[model samples]
Target: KVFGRCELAAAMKRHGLDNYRGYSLGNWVCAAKFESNFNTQATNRNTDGSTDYGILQINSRWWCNDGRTPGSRNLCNIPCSALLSSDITASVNCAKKIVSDGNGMNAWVAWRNRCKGTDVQAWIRGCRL
Candidate 1:
């Protein structure tokens, strides 16, 4: 859908992720920008032979099946391709589950490397809910 930053923020807020479960909205917003640039179809290969999928960049090793990966836990029980769509309901649901699994936003490398320990005010700047 090629969402603008404002639209993305609004959607996340609507989904109750603005400050979900203690993680800041800014962190999620910044992670989405860096991980997928708001593209649901975004995919990237990691150095450890794993692929990151969707806005949150869920990994194939533990979350979804990339088809090529043999031992994927697929804890989400969903195909990775499902993340590549304009409707992000499935991706959001999966992401929430991932975050709840202890590491929170740290599950995403993008969050740790970019959004963490940084003031991400500009990421949500002027993004009125």
Candidate 2:
């Protein structure tokens, strides 16, 4: 599913991503835009034998297990395939866990490069929440 900007913003908020671990809804929305463009099935295979999954592009190296990654920690305690679901609930939960583990939103390279030090107001400019 390719979610519209406001659609994803409202869904992320509903899933409790708003201000989770000091990251705002705009932050989440912005990260998704840069990471996967809100594509639910977006997948990227890294040169290091790892993969990034879903809208926020959660990593297989630490956050999830595809049953194939060499050193997966499964920190999110779910199959990497779960991240591909259009539901997005599990992906959002895993994102929260990533943030809770002291990485904050820095866990996402796209966030650092595209969202960090930027006002992400455009991400939620017309959203009520």
Candidate 3:
């Protein structure tokens, strides 16, 4: 399930990521916009020999057990498949873990490049959440 931007914002807020770890809902929303376009089933295989999964593009090598990446660590302690759901519960929870793990929102290359020094608040303009 691919979400519209507003819907994704609302969902993330419901899961308490609006201000989790100092990053705004806009930040996560922005990351998702560039990372997966709110697509629950998105997957990106990297040249670095790992795959990113789901909406936030959680990495197989560090966050979830993809059973394929050579160094898949599963720090989020979740199956990589869980992140690919429209529910997004696991995805949001894992994202929070990533932030609190001292990486902040900088774990995402898309985030670092696109959302780091920009205003992404506009992405949620029409969402009443």
TM-score of each: 0.91, 0.96, 0.96
Model 1, stretches more than 4 Å misplaced? none
- Could you tell me the C-alpha RMSD of candidate 2 in Å? 0.9
Please give, for residues 1-129, the per-residue lDDT of candidate 3 as tens digits.
999999999999999999898888899999999999889999999988889999999999899998888956889999999999989999999998898887789889999999987988988888899
Model 1 deviation from native, Cα RMSD in Å? 1.4
Off by over 4 Å in 2: none
lDDT of candidate model 3 versus the reference: 0.91
Model 1 TM? 0.91
Q: For residues 1-129, what per-residue lDDT tens digits would candidate 1 score against the true structure? A: 678888988888877787777877787889999999998888998777778888778889999987877666899989998888788887888888899999888888878998889998678888777
Model 1 misses residue 88 by how many Å? Answer: 1.1
Clashes of 2: 0
lDDT of each: 0.84, 0.91, 0.91
In candidate 2, the residue pairs with backbone N, CA or C atoms under 3 Å apart (3 or more residues apart, or in different chains) clash, namely none
* Regions more than 4 Å wrong, model 3: none
The superposed Cα distance between candidate 3 and the true structure at residue 104, in angstroms, equals 0.9
